[PDB]
Amino acid sequence: SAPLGPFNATLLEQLKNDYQKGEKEVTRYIELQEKVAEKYIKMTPLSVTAKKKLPPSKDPRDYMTLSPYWWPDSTKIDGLPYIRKDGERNPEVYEYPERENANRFGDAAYCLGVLYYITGKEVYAKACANHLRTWFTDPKLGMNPNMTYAQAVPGMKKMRGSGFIDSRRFSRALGVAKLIEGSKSWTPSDKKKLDDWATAFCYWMENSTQGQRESHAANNHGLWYEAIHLMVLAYLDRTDRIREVAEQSILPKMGAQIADDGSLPQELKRTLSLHYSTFALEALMEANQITSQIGINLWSTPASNGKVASQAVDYLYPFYLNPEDWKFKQIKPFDQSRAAILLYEAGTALGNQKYVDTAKRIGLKYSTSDVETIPYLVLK
């Protein structure tokens, strides 16, 4: 049985079982994934300290990014304070190296850790561990366990927790570290350091004002906060807290954010409303991968008002079939393929075979290098 973590454990256990039996289709698929993963064996580990412009703490180990929809105001001599254009990414975001480097690290650690679980090859644990040590626990290169300066905004006077949603890029890699435990390359000292980092990160996100505020956000930020929260708690093996989070935070959030007709009105007021409805359900999808490993199905368990997450999928399904029929603001085209994994996840959790069939009809490319698609041979 697969360790508790941020992945479809059923699909991952099935892939490993078939790989070890020498099942030909799976063996070839994993051999393709190994050719994809070679670049991560070669990759120099990234660090949040690889920036020149320091955060207000003067600590290069503090994560800092620009909130993506905030732009300099041309009518101000210094451009300050920045103003918001919902749905229009300011290219200035690429001036903060950790926005993309956290994504590159997360991909590399996720791919390598999953390949170690499937194949048992030490080379993948050794390379996974190298990325994990440098990003997380190194006393010089490792990130401080906080998101204080995530999605900062020039000129903004108030503190926000909005940037915490950036954590999902590296909290998935934190969770996969559970998969390399027991390797030779991941020592007891490595585990204790990362256990301590994860405990300090969990403390920060539960007790800092920014973490508290993000825990109560009325939209997909609150849903993603608990997805991240569950990844951290599952890394730390706190299964009682996972039950408590789902019952006391995730379910009440669903019950409030799903309307009677199954729409998500907080996402409907965005300029990318079909993307943000989908993104809210992707948060529930990642939360569910974890809750369902301990017996809780987030797709069909009702809130106290009887609302269920499947209602939100039902509402969106015809627009996954035909995005052009979407009737709310969507100022960039919607990528239909983001529905494939989502409809598969929800479909199998609900026994809804129309959803699974559509997940496969949409599908994913067999040879794609997108690391989140590794477990989904079933869609390829």
Ligand X SMILES: O=C(O)C1=C[C@H](O)[C@H](O)[C@H](O[C@H]2[C@H](O)[C@H](O)[C@H](O[C@H]3[C@H](O)[C@H](O)[C@H](O)O[C@@H]3C(=O)O)O[C@@H]2C(=O)O)O1
Give the footprint of ligand X on this chain (CB under 6 A).
67-69, 84, 86, 151, 162, 165, 219-221, 276, 279
Rounded to a whole number of angstroms, the minimum distance from the CB of residue 29 to ligand X is 32
Footprint of its own copies on residues 76-115 (CB under 8 A)?
A: 76-77, 79, 91, 94, 100
In the list its own copies, ligand X, none, the entry touching 370 (Cβ below 5 to 8 angstroms by class) is its own copies
Rounded to a whole number of angstroms, the minimum distance from the CB of residue 162 to ligand X is 4
Question: CA 55, 219, 205, 112 torsion: positive or negative?
Answer: negative
Interaction between residue 333 and its own copies (CB under 8 A): yes
Q: What does the alpha-carbon distance between residue 192 and residue 214 come to, in Å, rounded to a whole number?
A: 28
SS3 at position 332 = coil
Amino acid (one-letter) located at 197: W
Dmax (CA) of the chain: 67
Phi-psi region of 215 (alpha: psi -120 to 50; beta: other; left: phi over 0): alpha
The residue among 327, 311, 213, 189 whose CA lies nearest residue 258 is 311
Q: What does the alpha-carbon distance between residue 244 and residue 228 come to, in Å, rounded to a whole number?
A: 15
Do the beta carbons of residue 93 and residue 99 sit within 8 Å?
yes
Interaction between residue 336 and its own copies (CB under 8 A): no
CB closer to its own copies, 39 vs 192: 39
Half-sphere exposure of 146 (CA within 13 A, CB side): 15
In the list ligand X, its own copies, none, the entry touching 68 (Cβ below 5 to 8 angstroms by class) is ligand X
In the list its own copies, ligand X, none, the entry touching 203 (Cβ below 5 to 8 angstroms by class) is none
Eight-state DSSP code of residue 330: B
SS3 at position 152 = strand
CB closer to ligand X, 117 vs 224: 224
Both tokens assigned to 352: 């809804």
In the list its own copies, ligand X, none, the entry touching 221 (Cβ below 5 to 8 angstroms by class) is ligand X
Q: Figure out which of the listed residues 10, 185, 301, 369 binds its own copies, where binding follows CB under 8 A.
A: 369
Of the ranges 9-17, 61-69, 71-79, 153-161, which one interacts with its own copies (CB under 8 A)?
71-79
Interaction between residue 269 and its own copies (CB under 8 A): no
The residue among 264, 213, 270, 227 whose CA lies nearest residue 68 is 270
x/- map, 112-141, its own copies, by CB under 8 A: ------------------------------
Interaction between residue 368 and its own copies (CB under 8 A): yes
Give the chain's length: 380
Interaction between residue 332 and its own copies (CB under 8 A): yes
List contacts with its own copies (CB under 8 A): 35-36, 74-77, 79, 91, 94, 100, 331-333, 365, 367-370
